[PDB]
A = this chain, B = another copy of it.
């Protein structure tokens, strides 16, 4: 908006500002290790304690 003033200065027309805001994408990585012998007995079901 504007103000009207009695002063001799020119009045200024209606004005709008159009503003663009942009994203930021961030990337996150973690790592895990698993033993082969550990993965071995998982499939079978145990019989002896």
Show the binding face of A for B, using Cβ within 8 Å. 2, 4-6, 10-14, 26-33
Contact = CB atoms under 8 A, between A and B. Distances in A.
A33 B14 CA distance: 7
Contact of A31 (B11, B29, B33): B11
Q: How many copies of this chain?
A: 2
A30 B11 contact: yes
19 contacts: A2-B30, A4-B28, A4-B29, A4-B30, A5-B28, A6-B26, A6-B27, A6-B28, A6-B29, A10-B31, A11-B29, A11-B30, A11-B31, A12-B31, A13-B31, A13-B32, A13-B33, A14-B32, A14-B33
Contacts of A12: 31
